[PDB]
């Protein structure tokens, strides 16, 4: 038995998200199995959405109950999913699995589907704001640059025009609920060089022709 | 309503036996089910009816039940196993729920504690009427961390965005967590704290508006 | 005129087994041809009287008891049985004279997500006596512990829900049971078969 997801991969905020799962290894019209939807945000835990039966009745999460509804189609051997008023906390990969309920507490998902990623973002192309992360006044110290509110991936960061490579760590980016990414890059240097060496981060965002060179100096209290 | 609780990280050396627990008031009237999920892959069912093996599951996996706590036991843990493992159940009101997820790591390289750096909002960001706290976590092995935010000494939950642990150059892992504040909230409390927990250990950094 | 068997067998909703219904049938002509001649009945066992012989006897009162249990519990609706249903919800006498009829009602009594309307008495101190109906909802006490209607320790709710769902095994699916009791009382013959 195989389950395949179908639907648009982008949904703007506060909209209805439609997804249709198509199975091809048995029959949805069987009187022994449910058909559910499960999601998980990137790098988060799993969350069951709702399970539907070949009739029509279904049950959903308490949280996602008002803005959720599930349909089925035995003729096309497929069930669908509708999520009204989609905020950006809904950015997740949506799986459709097969649900078995033998006794009163026995409830598992036997074969899963590979799942589609739908990313909710009114995120138009946007250049990043670059802010210095000054080294703290309190043998080594860390300084960096905050690369904030850009879309889409990616951005490149170098230090002193690539002349400084030792001690540099550019972290992977977060996906905020604004639909915009944010990323940080830091370089660890000896504390004795904070007053004798210049540190400048070079941020490139090709989709927006953005290029910012931001000098990082210790913060003045 | 209920919540299934399981630890986020378990480390074992090759050949040893890993044990993942999952508990909740739900597990009274409820069974448990175990799924293994590899990176970029659909979850795979491993345990039926708390303690049973399907066909494609090798005998090295075993499940046990103890009151309000079920235990997934993998014997002879090999490299073929490293993944995220999930428990699941479904109460009287028909509420089908998952746990948070446990990342198994086969300790090849020794356990590495995370190095935590916490940045305050720059003076420039404040002048744009925004405030972002930057907490950066790196050089930890296994690659599973949990991050708690604090205002003075009170938990903060809104406006928290955290990356997944990602493998970096030296086969350790890295991650980052961001707190978005208004400059009023930043200047209201005396300090904010970033609390990183890695395998029972906890590292905390703190910054103040000066 | 005829006896209203249709009102019991073709009723849109049955009672929970702990509060099983009883329909008293009197002053009418009954036909037990149609009953044994259906094919939707998965259990049809008669005790003390043949089902084809009922069209020839006269009884004073015919009692029709109806309720809902799951499939595995159908075996307990018989004389001299034990179990949660036979001891705490519906007990038949050891010399029971009548027929027991049951059919799979999964199409009617189970809901997606669980039909929690059908209940059964899980706890009781002593066994029900024949044809006893306990509808109490008092909090069962096992000992002597303060609680005050709060489901705590040694203070739990005596009834329990089936939660019939359609994907259940037939042993846990709802079964509608009609118990026909033939009371040949010493009196004027009110219910004869024809």
Residue numbers in the entry:
A (entry chain A): 2 to 139, 144 to 226
B (entry chain B): 1 to 210
C (entry chain E): 334 to 527
What does the paper say about this structure?
Alpha-B.1.1.7, Beta-B.1.351, Gamma-P.1, and Delta-B.1.617.2 variants of SARS-CoV-2 express multiple mutations in the spike protein (S). The RBD mutations found in Alpha (N501Y), Beta (K417N, E484K, and N501Y), Gamma (K417T, E484K, and N501Y), and Delta (L452R and T478K) are located in or closely adjacent to the ACE2-interacting surface where they have the potential to modulate ACE2 interaction or disrupt the binding of neutralizing mAbs. A detailed structure-function analysis comprising 22 X-ray and cryo-EM structures is presented for 16 Fabs most in complexes with RBD or S, which allows an understanding of the changes in antigenicity of the Beta S protein.
6/11 of the Tyr-501-reactive mAbs used IgVH 4-39 (Beta-6, -10, -23, -40, -54, and -55), making IgVH4-39 a public antibody response following Beta infection, partly explaining the repositioning of the response toward Tyr501 relative to early pandemic strains (Yuan et al., 2020a). Beta-40 has the canonical 15 residue H3 found in four of the IgVH4-39 mAbs, including Beta-6. As predicted, the angle of attack of Beta-40 is essentially identical to Beta-6 and H1H2 positioning is very similar. In summary, the recurrent use of IgVH4-39 appears to signal a frequent public binding mode targeting residue Tyr-501, despite the mAbs harboring a wide range of different IgVL gene families.
